[PDB]
Design an enzyme around this catalytic site. Structure first.
Site, short mmCIF file in Angstrom:
data_model
loop_
_atom_site.label_atom_id
_atom_site.label_comp_id
_atom_site.label_asym_id
_atom_site.label_seq_id
_atom_site.Cartn_x
_atom_site.Cartn_y
_atom_site.Cartn_z
N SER A 46 0.85 -1.19 0.00
CA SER A 46 0.00 0.00 0.00
C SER A 46 0.88 1.24 0.00
O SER A 46 2.00 1.22 0.52
CB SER A 46 -0.95 0.02 1.21
OG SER A 46 -1.74 1.20 1.23
N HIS A 168 -2.57 -11.74 6.72
CA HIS A 168 -1.85 -12.79 6.00
C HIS A 168 -2.42 -14.18 6.21
O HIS A 168 -2.21 -15.06 5.36
CB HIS A 168 -0.37 -12.80 6.41
CG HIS A 168 0.41 -11.62 5.92
ND1 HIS A 168 1.35 -10.98 6.70
CD2 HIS A 168 0.38 -10.96 4.74
CE1 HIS A 168 1.87 -9.98 6.02
NE2 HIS A 168 1.30 -9.94 4.83
N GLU A 177 3.41 -9.77 12.04
CA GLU A 177 4.69 -10.43 11.77
C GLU A 177 5.39 -10.82 13.05
O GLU A 177 5.48 -10.03 14.00
CB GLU A 177 5.66 -9.54 10.96
CG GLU A 177 5.09 -8.98 9.69
CD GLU A 177 6.08 -8.06 8.97
OE1 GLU A 177 7.17 -7.79 9.54
OE2 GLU A 177 5.77 -7.61 7.85
N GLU A 220 6.77 -12.64 1.97
CA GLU A 220 8.12 -12.44 2.46
C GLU A 220 8.75 -13.73 2.95
O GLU A 220 9.82 -13.68 3.57
CB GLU A 220 8.16 -11.40 3.58
CG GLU A 220 7.53 -10.07 3.22
CD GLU A 220 6.12 -9.92 3.77
OE1 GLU A 220 5.65 -10.82 4.52
OE2 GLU A 220 5.47 -8.90 3.45
N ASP A 257 6.15 -7.18 14.50
CA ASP A 257 5.58 -6.05 13.75
C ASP A 257 4.08 -6.26 13.83
O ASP A 257 3.54 -7.14 13.15
CB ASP A 257 6.07 -6.00 12.30
CG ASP A 257 5.36 -4.93 11.47
OD1 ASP A 257 4.59 -4.12 12.02
OD2 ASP A 257 5.57 -4.89 10.24
N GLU A 303 7.43 -3.43 16.51
CA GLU A 303 7.26 -2.47 15.42
C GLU A 303 5.78 -2.15 15.25
O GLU A 303 4.94 -3.06 15.27
CB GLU A 303 7.85 -3.02 14.12
CG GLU A 303 7.57 -2.19 12.86
CD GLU A 303 8.08 -2.87 11.60
OE1 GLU A 303 9.01 -3.72 11.70
OE2 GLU A 303 7.52 -2.58 10.51
N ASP A 330 7.21 2.33 11.87
CA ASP A 330 7.17 2.08 10.42
C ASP A 330 6.09 2.98 9.82
O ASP A 330 6.41 4.05 9.28
CB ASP A 330 6.89 0.62 10.11
CG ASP A 330 6.68 0.36 8.61
OD1 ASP A 330 7.13 1.17 7.77
OD2 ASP A 330 6.05 -0.66 8.26
N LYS A 355 12.52 2.80 4.68
CA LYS A 355 12.19 2.26 3.36
C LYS A 355 12.56 3.33 2.34
O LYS A 355 11.86 4.34 2.22
CB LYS A 355 10.71 1.88 3.26
CG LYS A 355 10.35 0.65 4.12
CD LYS A 355 8.86 0.59 4.44
CE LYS A 355 8.46 -0.76 5.09
NZ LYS A 355 7.01 -0.78 5.43
N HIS A 383 13.14 -4.12 3.64
CA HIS A 383 12.56 -4.53 2.37
C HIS A 383 11.15 -3.96 2.21
O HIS A 383 10.57 -3.36 3.12
CB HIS A 383 12.51 -6.06 2.27
CG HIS A 383 11.65 -6.72 3.32
ND1 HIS A 383 11.40 -8.08 3.32
CD2 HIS A 383 11.00 -6.23 4.40
CE1 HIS A 383 10.62 -8.39 4.35
NE2 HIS A 383 10.37 -7.28 5.02
N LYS A 406 15.84 -5.67 7.93
CA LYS A 406 14.62 -6.47 7.94
C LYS A 406 14.32 -6.80 6.48
O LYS A 406 13.84 -5.94 5.73
CB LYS A 406 13.47 -5.70 8.58
CG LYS A 406 12.19 -6.51 8.78
CD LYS A 406 11.08 -5.52 9.13
CE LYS A 406 9.75 -6.18 9.28
NZ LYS A 406 8.68 -5.13 9.34
O1 LIG Z 1 5.32 -3.52 6.75
C1 LIG Z 1 6.60 -3.73 6.44
O2 LIG Z 1 7.51 -3.66 7.24
C2 LIG Z 1 6.84 -4.07 4.97
C3 LIG Z 1 7.36 -5.50 4.85
O3 LIG Z 1 7.47 -6.20 6.09
O4 LIG Z 1 5.55 -4.05 4.30
P1 LIG Z 1 5.07 -3.23 2.99
O5 LIG Z 1 6.25 -3.18 2.06
O6 LIG Z 1 3.87 -3.88 2.39
O7 LIG Z 1 4.77 -1.80 3.45
NA NA Z 2 -6.45 -13.07 9.53
NA NA Z 3 5.91 -2.86 9.01
#
Ligand SMILES: O=C(O)[C@@H](CO)OP(=O)(O)O
Ligand code: NA
Ligand code: NA
Length: 436
Positions: A46, A168, A177, A220, A257, A303, A330, A355, A383, A406
């Site tokens: 997203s 997920h 996560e 992932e 996370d 996270e 994040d 990111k 990532h 990560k």
């Molecule tokens: O949330 C996050 O840390 C990343 C991958 O773990 O997700 P996305 O790239 O979908 O924002």
């Molecule tokens: Na679910």
């Molecule tokens: Na995240």
């Protein structure tokens, strides 16, 4: 100057690791007939309103509307022309030329995905034409030539996704996560081996519990069994750590996370911590994490434990746990320097998930990391859920000296290639006496 200058850029639509289009860029330089480097942009699941705009075609007849022909055309027609003739040795100037060419705060004229892909490819090209490791090229850009000259390097600790809940998975577990971290003070090759062995054992444990489908993996590479609670997830992970022959809380640590914005209701101000079952206030969410860490003291990082704008919640979470664990913003920050400045001042958290493609260029991402480094907080280079064959973030995490990466489970090529690139870097550092 004709030496180490851009001749042209060529953009290309490729597939990312989820099978969606993304932008790849070839760099031509030094009059050479074949590209000196090729890199591509990743893509998150997203993209919001405080991030670089990911430019997609919206043609429902191609790639279900997710083509990037427009962004690719902006590489060929605009961004390429903006860096032609410029030196590959000055990354800041290249990134600034990309930023200026687009001229929009959210990079929504030419597309953030085009800009990131050009930044990645140009940095990869600069190191290539200088016949030097990319992490050295990036270190020099981050630190300046004077501090770079005798700089030594450290390898990160990986935060390794191995179990997923939330959107997920099919259970009522809402935390998104679950990660393992190997202990910090050991060679990176032993960190890699440790987490790979735990990951294998978890897959076998889950296949014994639920059959062959239980070893299928998410985007992932993590497993997504049907679970109700974080305790269930952490208990499976702790079992796998033991089967690999490691000691929970000594050899292997845990991290979460939560992606808690996903289960926050801003009208009720409640976190749906267990699907359709349990609903917590911000305060009760903090207490939930406190007790989860009490039950699982190997948890050393959380996270996005509270929603992206629940600043009063974050202040309290960091008040109560910040001295014990990493509190990673994040969605809290979306690699945005305005938000990072505010969060440092208001003490929302104590670490940043970085990111590059959320902010745009490598140089912009370095400034964000600097703000965090400057106050003694931690940078985790991240990532995205859609990754590519580009392993630049491995060179970036070492080059800027961040403590953590990560970049997924130890499975799927777009995740393991980052671990393998760090294995190469570790060997290079050992061979040349650069290992700090
Ligand atoms: O949330 C996050 O840390 C990343 C991958 O773990 O997700 P996305 O790239 O979908 O924002
Ligand atoms: Na679910
Ligand atoms: Na995240």
């Amino acid at each position: 100057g004709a030496v180490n200058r851009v001749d042209k850029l060529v953009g290309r639509e490729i597939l990312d690791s989820r099978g969606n289009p993304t932008v790849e860029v070839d760099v031509y330089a030094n009059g050479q007939k074949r590209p000196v480097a090729t890199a591509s942009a990743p893509s998150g699941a997203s993209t919001g309103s405080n991030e670089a705009h990911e430019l997609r075609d919206g043609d429902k007849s191609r790639y279900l509307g997710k083509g990037v022909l427009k962004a690719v055309k902006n590489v060929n027609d605009v961004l390429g022309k903006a860096v032609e003739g410029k030196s590959l040795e000055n990354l800041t100037e290249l990134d600034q030329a990309l930023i200026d060419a687009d001229g929009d705060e959210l990079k929504s004229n030419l597309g953030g995905n085009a800009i990131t892909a050009c930044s990645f490819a140009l940095a990869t090209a600069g190191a290539a034409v200088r016949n030097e490791e990319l992490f050295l090229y990036l270190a020099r850009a981050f630190h300046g030539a004077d501090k770079f000259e005798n700089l030594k390097f450290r390898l990160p600790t990986p935060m390794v996704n191995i179990l997923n809940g939330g959107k997920h998975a099919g259970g009522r577990l809402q935390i998104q996560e679950f990660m393992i971290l190997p202990k910090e003070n050991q060679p990176f090759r032993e960190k890699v081996r440790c987490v790979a062995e735990v990951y294998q054992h978890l897959g076998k444990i889950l296949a014994e519990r639920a059959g062959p489908s239980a070893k299928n993996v998410g985007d992932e590479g993590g497993f997504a069994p049907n679970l109700e609670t974080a305790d269930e997830a952490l208990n499976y992970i702790e079992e796998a750590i033991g089967k690999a022959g490691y000691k929970v809380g000594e050899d292997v640590f845990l991290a979460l996370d939560a992606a808690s914005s996903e289960f926050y209701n801003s009208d009720t101000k409640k976190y749906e911590i267990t699907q359709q079952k349990e609903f917590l206030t911000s305060e009760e969410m903090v207490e939930y994490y406190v007790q989860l860490v009490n039950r699982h003291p190997a948890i050393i990082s959380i996270e996005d434990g509270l929603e992206e704008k629940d600043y009063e919640g974050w202040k309290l979470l960091t008040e109560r746990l910040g001295s014990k664990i990493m509190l990673v913003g994040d969605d809290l920050y979306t690699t945005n320097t305005r938000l990072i400045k505010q969060g440092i001042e208001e003490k929302w958290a104590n670490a940043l998930l970085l990111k590059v493609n959320q902010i745009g260029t490598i140089t912009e991402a370095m400034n964000a990391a600097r703000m965090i480094f400057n106050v003694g907080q931690k940078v985790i280079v991240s990532h995205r859920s859609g990754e590519t064959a580009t392993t630049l973030i491995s060179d970036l995490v070492v080059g800027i000296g961040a403590t953590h990466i990560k970049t997924g489970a130890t499975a799927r090529g777009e995740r393991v290639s980052k671990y393998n690139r760090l294995l190469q870097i570790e060997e290079y550092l050992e061979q040349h006496g650069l290992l700090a």
